[PDB]
Enzyme design. Structure first.
Site, mmCIF file in Angstrom:
data_model
loop_
_atom_site.group_PDB
_atom_site.id
_atom_site.type_symbol
_atom_site.label_atom_id
_atom_site.label_comp_id
_atom_site.label_asym_id
_atom_site.label_seq_id
_atom_site.Cartn_x
_atom_site.Cartn_y
_atom_site.Cartn_z
ATOM 1 N N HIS A 74 1.082 -0.942 -0.062
ATOM 2 C CA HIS A 74 0.531 -0.043 0.476
ATOM 3 C C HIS A 74 1.170 1.393 0.089
ATOM 4 O O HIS A 74 1.869 1.153 0.439
ATOM 5 C CB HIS A 74 -1.191 -0.054 0.908
ATOM 6 C CG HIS A 74 -0.414 0.176 2.711
ATOM 7 N ND1 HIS A 74 0.479 -0.365 2.749
ATOM 8 C CD2 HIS A 74 -0.700 1.267 3.804
ATOM 9 C CE1 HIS A 74 0.928 -0.091 3.869
ATOM 10 N NE2 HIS A 74 -0.159 0.789 4.128
ATOM 11 N N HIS A 76 1.165 3.883 1.734
ATOM 12 C CA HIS A 76 2.139 4.506 3.130
ATOM 13 C C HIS A 76 3.467 4.076 3.225
ATOM 14 O O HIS A 76 4.067 3.278 2.512
ATOM 15 C CB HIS A 76 0.951 3.884 4.905
ATOM 16 C CG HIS A 76 0.069 4.926 4.966
ATOM 17 N ND1 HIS A 76 -1.176 4.091 6.210
ATOM 18 C CD2 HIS A 76 -0.260 6.103 3.936
ATOM 19 C CE1 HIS A 76 -1.601 4.956 5.825
ATOM 20 N NE2 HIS A 76 -1.758 5.910 4.666
ATOM 21 N N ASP A 78 5.644 3.070 5.619
ATOM 22 C CA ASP A 78 6.243 1.915 5.711
ATOM 23 C C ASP A 78 6.095 0.972 4.915
ATOM 24 O O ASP A 78 6.771 -0.493 5.371
ATOM 25 C CB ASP A 78 5.150 1.504 7.379
ATOM 26 C CG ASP A 78 4.048 1.021 7.321
ATOM 27 O OD1 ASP A 78 3.751 1.449 6.097
ATOM 28 O OD2 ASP A 78 3.374 0.677 7.544
ATOM 29 N N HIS A 136 -7.486 -0.655 5.818
ATOM 30 C CA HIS A 136 -7.055 -0.066 6.497
ATOM 31 C C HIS A 136 -6.724 1.117 5.725
ATOM 32 O O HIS A 136 -6.933 2.551 5.904
ATOM 33 C CB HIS A 136 -5.806 -0.535 6.571
ATOM 34 C CG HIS A 136 -4.565 0.637 6.888
ATOM 35 N ND1 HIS A 136 -4.663 1.065 8.084
ATOM 36 C CD2 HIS A 136 -3.123 0.283 5.566
ATOM 37 C CE1 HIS A 136 -3.132 1.595 8.133
ATOM 38 N NE2 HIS A 136 -3.031 1.705 6.631
ATOM 39 N N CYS A 155 -0.835 -3.864 5.978
ATOM 40 C CA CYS A 155 -1.166 -3.123 7.081
ATOM 41 C C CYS A 155 -2.988 -3.058 7.337
ATOM 42 O O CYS A 155 -3.868 -2.578 7.904
ATOM 43 C CB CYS A 155 -1.252 -1.697 7.048
ATOM 44 S SG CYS A 155 0.569 -1.729 7.079
ATOM 45 N N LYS A 158 -5.811 -6.814 10.958
ATOM 46 C CA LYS A 158 -6.102 -5.638 12.305
ATOM 47 C C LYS A 158 -6.579 -6.410 13.254
ATOM 48 O O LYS A 158 -7.844 -5.907 13.254
ATOM 49 C CB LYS A 158 -6.305 -4.641 12.061
ATOM 50 C CG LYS A 158 -5.385 -3.409 10.816
ATOM 51 C CD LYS A 158 -4.029 -3.039 11.698
ATOM 52 C CE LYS A 158 -2.915 -2.176 11.416
ATOM 53 N NZ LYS A 158 -3.991 -1.012 10.345
ATOM 54 N N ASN A 164 -4.667 3.371 12.424
ATOM 55 C CA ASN A 164 -4.518 4.974 12.077
ATOM 56 C C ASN A 164 -5.693 4.852 11.361
ATOM 57 O O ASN A 164 -4.914 4.500 10.028
ATOM 58 C CB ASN A 164 -3.574 5.049 11.797
ATOM 59 C CG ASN A 164 -4.135 6.887 12.038
ATOM 60 O OD1 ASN A 164 -4.449 6.778 11.239
ATOM 61 N ND2 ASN A 164 -2.199 7.409 12.669
ATOM 62 N N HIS A 194 1.780 -4.574 11.290
ATOM 63 C CA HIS A 194 2.146 -4.642 12.447
ATOM 64 C C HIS A 194 2.212 -5.660 14.187
ATOM 65 O O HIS A 194 1.518 -4.896 15.296
ATOM 66 C CB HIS A 194 1.279 -2.952 12.558
ATOM 67 C CG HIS A 194 1.072 -2.488 11.904
ATOM 68 N ND1 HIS A 194 2.782 -1.643 11.879
ATOM 69 C CD2 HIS A 194 1.226 -2.255 10.866
ATOM 70 C CE1 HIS A 194 2.705 -1.238 10.968
ATOM 71 N NE2 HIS A 194 1.842 -0.882 9.952
HETATM 72 O O1 LIG Z 1 -3.248 2.254 10.882
HETATM 73 C C1 LIG Z 1 -1.643 2.180 10.779
HETATM 74 O O2 LIG Z 1 -1.497 0.330 9.972
HETATM 75 C C2 LIG Z 1 -0.382 2.260 11.341
HETATM 76 N N1 LIG Z 1 -0.120 3.142 11.939
HETATM 77 C C3 LIG Z 1 0.658 4.177 10.666
HETATM 78 O O3 LIG Z 1 0.472 5.019 10.666
HETATM 79 C C4 LIG Z 1 1.838 3.467 10.383
HETATM 80 C C5 LIG Z 1 1.960 3.514 8.560
HETATM 81 S S1 LIG Z 1 0.568 1.746 7.698
HETATM 82 C C6 LIG Z 1 2.998 4.593 10.163
HETATM 83 C C7 LIG Z 1 3.949 4.588 11.783
HETATM 84 C C8 LIG Z 1 4.784 3.516 11.992
HETATM 85 C C9 LIG Z 1 6.221 3.649 10.278
HETATM 86 C C10 LIG Z 1 6.917 1.983 10.765
HETATM 87 C C11 LIG Z 1 6.816 0.945 11.917
HETATM 88 C C12 LIG Z 1 5.637 1.664 12.161
HETATM 89 C C13 LIG Z 1 4.576 2.022 12.683
HETATM 90 C C14 LIG Z 1 -0.236 1.488 13.436
HETATM 91 C C15 LIG Z 1 -0.323 1.908 14.259
HETATM 92 C C16 LIG Z 1 -0.678 1.292 15.568
HETATM 93 C C17 LIG Z 1 -0.419 0.172 15.519
HETATM 94 C C18 LIG Z 1 -1.218 -0.556 16.721
HETATM 95 N N2 LIG Z 1 -1.990 -1.661 16.591
HETATM 96 C C19 LIG Z 1 -3.297 -1.435 15.661
HETATM 97 N N3 LIG Z 1 -4.674 -1.294 15.445
HETATM 98 N N4 LIG Z 1 -4.612 -1.438 17.154
HETATM 99 N N5 LIG Z 1 -3.185 -0.854 17.758
HETATM 100 S S2 LIG Z 1 -0.939 -0.624 13.628
HETATM 101 ZN ZN LIG Z 2 -0.288 2.214 6.164
HETATM 102 ZN ZN LIG Z 3 1.368 0.017 7.978
#
Ligand SMILES: O=C(O)/C(=N\C(=O)[C@@H](CS)CCc1ccccc1)c1ccc(Cn2cnnn2)s1
Ligand SMILES: [Zn+2]
Ligand SMILES: [Zn+2]
Length: 216
Positions: A74, A76, A78, A136, A155, A158, A164, A194
């Site tokens: 995707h 983003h 990461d 997502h 991503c 979940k 996010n 994640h």
């Molecule tokens: O939504 C997401 O996939 C993710 N957030 C992001 O914005 C992510 C891009 S998808 C950027 C931050 C990031 C960058 C590198 C390595 C790890 C995290 C997450 C944030 C916190 C997460 C943990 N989990 C998911 N639902 N409840 N908590 S996953």
């Molecule tokens: Zn993402």
């Molecule tokens: Zn991600």
């Protein structure tokens, strides 16, 4: 905090993991994969930075593997953080037409090669890309490895929470998760971006979390 780690997950398949402090969420891992097909390596999601991508590539090069390409699940960073460096090294990069358009709209460097459709073989009968629909993000796709029955869900997977929702499509996610669970119930391993690797039950957990998110 910890440095990029690369560990074997199953035959011809490695999981690469970087960690990041994400405001409001604490330390969060980012898992991607490297898949080997006869002497060649394919990146399933690039690391977040040019330097972690150089590290990942160099780890396989130093073991005699040529990087045949990378696919980003995707838009983003990461998943696409490494495309600029890969392109600068003339390593083929791939992403769906939706992902490249989001990257373009975003002023980010695009994959050199794109694809569309519900299914796309990155490598015929060995590495397949499937688009379950918006979740997502609008463009999220998953990668399936037929031999080992390994699904890289990115991503989109979940199981314990949606994360996010800034670019999520809460309306569509449950339909997207239903289609994905129908398609890959046959998975032995599901690798989220994640959270820890799990089994096919992670597809069910994601459907539940998406359903839950549509309500509230
Ligand atoms: O939504 C997401 O996939 C993710 N957030 C992001 O914005 C992510 C891009 S998808 C950027 C931050 C990031 C960058 C590198 C390595 C790890 C995290 C997450 C944030 C916190 C997460 C943990 N989990 C998911 N639902 N409840 N908590 S996953
Ligand atoms: Zn993402
Ligand atoms: Zn991600």
């Amino acid at each position: 905090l910890p440095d990029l780690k690369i560990e074997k997950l199953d035959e011809g398949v490695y999981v690469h993991t970087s960690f990041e402090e994400v405001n409001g969420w604490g330390v969060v891992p980012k898992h991607g994969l490297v898949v080997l097909v006869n002497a060649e390596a394919y990146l399933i999601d690039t690391p977040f930075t040019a330097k972690d991508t150089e590290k990942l590539v160099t780890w396989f090069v130093e073991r005699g593997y040529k990087i045949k390409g990378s696919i980003s699940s995707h838009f983003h960073s990461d998943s696409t953080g490494g495309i600029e460096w890969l392109n600068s090294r003339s390593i083929p990069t791939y992403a769906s037409e939706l992902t490249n358009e989001l990257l373009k709209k975003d002023g980010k460097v695009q994959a050199t090669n794109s694809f569309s459709g519900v299914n796309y073989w990155l490598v015929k009968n060995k590495i397949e890309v499937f688009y379950p629909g918006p979740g997502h993000t609008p463009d999220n796709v998953v990668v399936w490895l037929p031999e080992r029955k390994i699904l890289f869900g990115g991503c989109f997977i979940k199981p314990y929470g949606l994360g996010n929702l800034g670019d999520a499509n809460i309306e569509a996610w449950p339909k997207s998760a239903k289609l994905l669970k129908s398609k890959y119930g046959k998975a032995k391993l599901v690798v989220p971006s994640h959270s820890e690797v799990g089994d096919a039950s992670l597809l069910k957990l994601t459907l539940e979390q998406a359903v839950k998110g549509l309500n509230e």
